[PDB]
A paper describes a structure:
Gabija is one of the most prevalent anti-phage defence systems, occurring in more than 15% of all sequenced bacterial and archaeal genomes, but the molecular basis of how Gabija defends cells from viral infection remains poorly understood. Bacterial Gabija defence operons encode the proteins GajA and GajB, which together protect cells against diverse phages. Gabija protein A (GajA) is a DNA endonuclease that tetramerizes to form the core of the anti-phage defence complex. Two sets of Gabija protein B (GajB) dimers dock at opposite sides of the complex and create a 4:4 GajA–GajB assembly (hereafter, GajAB) that is essential for phage resistance in vivo.
Protein interaction analysis showed that Gad1 binds directly to GajAB, and we used cryo-EM to determine a 2.6 Å structure of the GajAB–Gad1 co-complex assembly. The GajAB–Gad1 co-complex structure reveals a mechanism of inhibition in which Gad1 proteins form an oligomeric web that wraps 360° around the host defence complex. Eight copies of phage Gad1 encircle the GajAB assembly, forming a 4:4:8 GajAB–Gad1 complex that is around 775 kDa in size. Gad1 mainly recognizes the GajA nuclease core, forming extensive contacts along the surface of the GajA dimerization domain. Key GajAB–Gad1 contacts include hydrogen-bond interactions from a Gad1 positively charged loop located between β5 and β6 with GajA α2D, and hydrophobic packing interactions between Gad1 Y190 and F192 with GajA α2D. The Gad1 tetrameric interface is formed by hydrogen-bond interactions between the C-terminal ‘shoulder’ domain of each Gad1 monomer and a highly conserved set of three cysteine residues, C282, C284 and C285, which form disulfide interactions at an inter-subunit interface. The N terminus of each Gad1 monomer forms an ‘arm’ domain that extends out from the shoulder and reaches around the GajA nuclease active site to connect to a partnering Gad1 protomer from the opposite side of the complex. Each pair of Gad1 proteins that wrap around and connect at the edge of the GajAB complex are formed by one Gad1 protomer reaching out from the shoulder with an arm domain extended straight down and one Gad1 protomer reaching out with an arm domain bent around 35° to the left. Superposition of the GajAB–Gad1 and GajAB complexes shows that Gad1 binding does not induce a notable conformational change in GajAB, and suggests that Gad1 instead functions through steric hindrance of Gabija anti-phage defence. Notably, the Gad1 arm domain directly occupies this putative DNA-binding surface, supporting a model in which the phage protein directly clashes with the path of target dsDNA.
Residue numbers in the entry:
A (entry chain N): 160 to 197
B (entry chain A), D (entry chain C): -71 to -42, -38 to -27, -10 to 255, 258 to 575
C (entry chain I): 198 to 293
E (entry chain D): 39 to 255, 258 to 308
F (entry chain M): 198 to 215, 231 to 288
Write the structure that this text describes.
């Protein structure tokens, strides 16, 4: 059971967007093709 | 007098005689419902009132360029072809002047008059049929605009006329449009300013082969996206995009190199002139919005790249036309003027376009001007207009239909016939064996017969009625070279039908002869059986010599037995020598395709001239035109 | 999926929204039917549509049962009606 | 390994192996004189030293627009066709850049580089053959200009190379021409100012599809009259005309209305500005001379009127090219680039142009780009270049020749083959009966097979060698459906040759099988004779099952007996009921054309799908491409 | 002005001389255009050094101060063509041909002729020069981040366009029409042209009045601003060649106040 | 407000198994349909700080306040 490449990316983005702390981290680029959190 | 359904009736004409008696005789053979028209004015065409037919009946062109006086019958789908290229182009222009506002607004020059004789007036009259008022929605579109210009007496017919008399004082020819149900008195088409009532009902879309796709998408992209509705999700996306483009412009202004330049160029401008202005480098799309520069992109499946293939873009340009045709104009009659679509188009795409024009219902009304037979591969239920090679500009019109009997062979039949339309003299042969021999004989005798207008059309297993009726109506000379054949009915022994004779008789309009019985012994087989049939064929040919004489007048050449026997008469010693056989005719008939090739290979120039000059092969002389 | 609202939805749109420069003009519309996407499928790779999967069965009748059962529940989740909840003015759907 | 005469030899290839052993093996099968090249760099083409072959050997295009790396063999007459319209146009442009001074002087843009990648170097190399130096005058023209760029070792070959590297600093791509006998080191073509040595030897005449006749006559009329000798009598006439035109101008000035206008317009000018000038009205021709405005007039015999038609203007514009070709450039090699001549040209005129290009010697060297099969009706001794539909731009080249055996059927053979060239999959059938059935079956199953690239080419009485060799070399898929046939030898009794089997064997390269003898009783005739032959055909088909298996690999489908028997194996029960005859197969064979049409009419959709899905009719699946 | 262009401008010179270009249409006479230059102030003038470097050995130490650039053309009645041959050298009696490869010669490296015509479209003028203006400038890390950020923004714009129902409906419908036309595995997408090519493709200068939010593409506003672009390029576009401006009838459709402004630029 | 679902660790369990709400919009200057932000006014600098401080809390307590159980139609 190997997960898909695109599906693998989607869950990380969804969880990162879910429970990050604005005190310590921010998301600059939030796109389907790319994701950057600084 | 020519009927609407293709029926032709012959009547005797008398000098100083009213036409009422002829009209009464025609009605009795088949009065208020029918209308009689001669050359577009009320052979004589007939109008059968409430029938299933096109809105467009015919068009008359007078003193316009080439056309001294020309009347052409029309249909919903019309194809115009011929050697006279100026005649074809001017015919399309006459339609544009009548129906297209953009062409009409320029008026008529001195050159637009026939022979540059400005004294004569230009007349372009289009006759329409409104009998099927309730069945056809497009008829209702025309009636609503016309309003009171009609008369209840002539509720079935309608005329749209264009008149122009040159003004020598002003060096200008003014186009005045009139319409009405009565041809004698037509009122001017009402209008305000540049537009008139006719421009509301008729839309002319001129498709030229050299059309830029992005240009085509440019004008129509406005309608395609305002016509559709917009839900809440689309509005949110639309506002979101505007924010994204605004941020793009903001980010552009944040760059050091761009900020440096626009600061420097501002100082340069200020030094030039003491004006309180600033210069900014902003993206053009981000200022105008995404809508300004949106264009279609051909995306190959499985490929991420976007591509701006020329042939791919050429074909898809028609897809936009197909898409618009479904929903762009539901309130007007759309006429497509498609001129030379085959220009820079692959023959496979020409067949694709042919299927769209005739099989599909996308283009209900169109006028197609073509030079390529491939565009006519799918032709059906269309009107064929042929412009003769003469400079006088004669136009012959035929309403092309394929019957239900020919439906199974329609594809093969259309492919053969399409090439014959672009010819002056067409010789109808049976199979490839005749074609192989005639091609060799013509090669040695008249090698450029195809250049002069000759054409060898081969037809097999079908009556000549479909081909001859089309060719005769179009003014193309047709020559039929067939042979006397006996066909045995299935399930019945010893009885044969004069298939070869019946086909020629059917061309003359006579009924088929009855089947005859031939008594042969059971022992008589093979060559003995064949020669017995040949004896009966010779007897039958002699018996119906009067009919054979009629065929010769109609350019129908019926062989006494078959082509091989006629060939043997023309060249007996030569054929016997090269075939090295006791009976060359029997050997040649054993394997017709291979033996004819072997015979043709060993034929000499003298033998080919002997065949050409022989009496039996008079069809070759007729095809050549000598 | 077609679902309706008891109270028709009032909203405002711009028919000038596709272009930026010209001044925006507001027009009202009233939508009572809300559409949510529930099933999209393609026979092959086209756009973002999920490629349909081939039906597999250990036996012809077993394959028939798999096809039949898959169609039933897929069709059932589409035919069965859904309406919004007035207790939360449209935050969640409920059987009517 | 590909020979110069078309013979192909296959050799096994190893890894890390010199090509010398393969070259030695080929030489022994057929060394210093022969030259080996691969893709234009010294399947691998060979050189046959001194032949009567064309000067143009091949052209290599690298990184130029579409062409990533393309090597195309050439000849004196070259025809380029295919679906990829951009590839065809860019190929002609690559020739213009190499040889035409006017195109070359503009340099290369950024777009002219492959994928717009300016880092890559554009290369266009043309290879020429100088072996036939003593017999060819055009070879002497080339080597006279070349002078010392050749080497005695490579006296047979010559290269003309175009090189270009983009200059990112200047945003310009400079075209540098090199030439020489050795490809590794080429010297720059010497030149002064705008012209170079190459422009003295090569003349490129670009015949655009649409040209203005009077434009064409305008430039050439200067040369046409000055080159001819002028005797004393012509000199007297020339002086007399000048006197006549002078008198015309003098008489114009004698008119009252002319004198009145020019007198007052002088006063108006003088009032405008105090300048001592006078204004006169003179005819322009009378001032410049009669030579200034002399133009050709197509005068119909028996008619005193002079006319500037349109198609005749296009045809006569070619005769000017014909006239100039004979006697204008006797000191340079003239290459004609004729692009899409069929545009707005009647099909009869297309055949006329085809005869000029191939039958006549007017156009010694030309590159013809066409979309119409009619322009290839007379094709012979020409090189056919096909551009594949793929965007990658593959080019397949074949040297088209018609053997002396096919000379008698050349006209019929060329007409059929010309349409097949513009196709992807070609199914070779025997006659019209197969075409009638397959057209009906395909119409019900795959109605748009012609759109997708399918084509039904019928061949009869000839071996498939000519068609297959042309189609295979051009990259067109060829499928063959033939039947096992027994042909009786002329003058001999009871002996037959496996004509059906031999044709398929000839395609595989194997020799023809020997003729077999058949012993039948004299009484046995008709049906009994036919079934006896069918029994032997079945036995022969079983005996050579290994060869039949080979045929299936090469897409050759040989029927066990004939098409009718294969048809019976698929829809036999349907055939029995529609025919209502005891033996449907025998009845169908009695009158093949008429009975097949009758059967096709009564066929239903299910029967057509049964025929399509049957194993015997697997050629239909191959033609469709499923 | 044309005689100067034929001598120094590659684009004009490549067309050769017609029959009309000869005096009184007398092709028997040889067209000759000779430009004499002074190289005496070599040590101080940098543009003299630009010319000397290209010229190389065509000079003579005896005549190190004077230089000639000559254009000769004799009509070819056989070919109906007048070939332009450029020569140069310090001695006028004997001049060697200017060396060159292909279309360009050594003279085109040193001399740049900028032809200013009164009818010049500003956006056209900015079209070619915008490539140079931004590539020459140095790009730092912050600018590189903004480049990548903008590319992401334009990509999202194209993605959002595809999510519209009316856009999705049309491109699905027209795909079916195209597939019906011919059985090819092809899909049709409606994408913004700028977003495909990037913001750089369609960037143009917008003359913005101070204190005004609107962006405007006045005609005289453009004519003056077109000249400032020429001024801006003149400072830094060509530091490696001698730039000659051929300004023909600048006053055409120019207000007299702008004419004086242009006069100050030319001379002051 | 993201009321679609409770946040920690559900997307994973859903994979193993096999209406939008607008709460605050603002803009410094008139743009699209965004409401205009009110410029903070304070008699004294410390008075202003308290005024804007209390404005931030009640506004943002509204923003971060949890979802509604939604008895009837619940999650679906």
């Amino acid at each position: 059971c190997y997960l898909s490449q695109e599906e693998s990316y989607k869950i990380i983005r969804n969880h990162i967007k879910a429970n990050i702390n604005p005190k310590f981290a921010r998301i600059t680029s939030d796109y389907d093709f790319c994701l950057t959190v600084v | 007098v020519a009927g609407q359904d293709g029926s032709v009736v012959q009547f005797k004409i008398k000098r100083h005689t009213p036409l009422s008696k002829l009209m009464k005789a025609y009605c009795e053979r088949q009065m208020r419902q029918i209308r009689f028209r001669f050359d577009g004015q009320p052979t004589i065409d007939v109008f059968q009132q409430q029938t299933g037919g096109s809105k467009f009946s015919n068009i008359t062109i007078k003193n316009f360029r080439n056309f001294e006086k020309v009347n052409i019958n029309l249909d919903n789908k019309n194809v115009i072809f011929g050697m006279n290229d100026i005649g074809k182009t001017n015919f399309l222009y006459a339609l544009r002047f009548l129906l297209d506002k953009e062409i009409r607004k320029f008026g008529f020059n001195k050159s637009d008059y026939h022979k540059h004789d400005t004294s004569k007036k230009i007349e372009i009259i289009l006759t329409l049929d409104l009998s099927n008022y309730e069945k056809d929605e497009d008829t209702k579109k025309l009636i609503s605009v016309v309003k009171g210009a009609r008369t209840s007496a002539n509720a079935d017919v309608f005329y749209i006329a264009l008149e122009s008399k040159y003004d020598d004082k002003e060096l200008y020819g003014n186009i005045i449009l009139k319409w009405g149900s009565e041809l004698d008195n037509l009122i001017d088409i009402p209008g305000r300013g540049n537009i008139n009532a006719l421009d509301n009902v008729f839309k002319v879309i001129y498709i030229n082969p050299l059309v830029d796709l992005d240009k085509l998408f440019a004008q129509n992209k406005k309608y395609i996206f305002e016509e559709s509705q917009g839900n809440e999700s689309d509005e949110g996306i639309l506002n979101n995009i505007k924010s994204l483009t605004d941020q793009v412009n903001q980010q552009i202004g944040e760059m050091t190199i761009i900020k440096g330049f626009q600061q420097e160029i501002t100082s340069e401008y200020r030094s030039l002139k003491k004006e309180e202005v600033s210069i900014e480098l902003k993206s053009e799309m981000a200022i105008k919005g995404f809508f300004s520069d949106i264009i279609p992109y051909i995306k190959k499946d499985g490929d991420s790249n976007y591509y701006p293939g020329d042939g791919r873009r050429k074909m898809l340009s028609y897809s936009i036309y197909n898409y618009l045709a479904k929903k762009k104009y539901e309130d007007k009659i759309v006429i497509y003027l498609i001129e030379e679509p085959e220009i820079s188009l692959h023959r496979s795409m020409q067949i694709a376009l042919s299927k769209q024009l005739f099989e599909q219902s996308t283009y209900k009304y169109f006028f197609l001007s073509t030079h390529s037979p491939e565009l006519l591969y799918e032709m059906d239920n269309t009107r064929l207009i042929r412009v003769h090679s003469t400079e006088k500009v004669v136009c012959s019109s035929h309403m092309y239909n394929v019957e239900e009997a020919y439906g199974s062979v329609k594809k093969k039949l259309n492919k053969a016939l399409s090439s014959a339309l672009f010819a002056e003299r067409v010789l109808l042969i049976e199979g490839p064996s005749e074609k192989i021999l005639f091609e060799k004989v013509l090669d040695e005798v008249e090698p450029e017969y195809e250049l002069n207008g000759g054409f060898l059309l081969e037809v097999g297993g079908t009556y000549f009625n479909h081909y001859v009726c089309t060719l005769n109506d179009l003014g193309i000379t047709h020559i039929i070279k067939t042979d006397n054949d006996l066909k045995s009915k299935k399930g019945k022994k010893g009885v044969y039908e004069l298939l070869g004779l019946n086909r020629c008789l059917n061309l003359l309009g006579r009924e088929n002869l009855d089947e005859i019985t031939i008594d042969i012994p059971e022992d008589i087989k093979g060559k003995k059986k064949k020669e017995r049939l040949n004896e009966r064929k010779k007897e039958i040919f002699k018996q119906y010599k009067n009919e054979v004489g009629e065929f010769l007048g109609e350019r129908i050449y019926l062989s006494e037995i078959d082509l091989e026997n006629d060939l043997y008469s023309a060249i007996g010693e030569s054929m016997k020598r090269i075939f090295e056989n006791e009976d060359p005719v029997h050997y040649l008939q054993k394997s017709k395709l291979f033996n004819m090739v072997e015979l043709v290979n060993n034929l000499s120039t003298k033998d080919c001239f002997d065949v050409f000059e022989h009496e039996k092969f008079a069809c070759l002389k007729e095809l050549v035109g000598s | 999926k077609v679902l309706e609202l008891y109270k028709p939805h009032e909203y405002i749109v711009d028919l000038n929204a596709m272009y930026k420069r010209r001044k925006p003009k507001l027009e009202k519309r009233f939508q009572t039917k809300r559409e949510v996407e529930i099933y999209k499928v393609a026979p092959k790779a086209y756009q973002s549509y999920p490629i349909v999967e081939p039906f597999s069965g250990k036996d012809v009748e077993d394959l028939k049962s798999n096809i039949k059962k898959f169609l039933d529940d897929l069709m059932a989740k589409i035919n069965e009606p859904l309406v919004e909840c007035k207790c939360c003015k449209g935050r969640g759907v409920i059987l009517n």
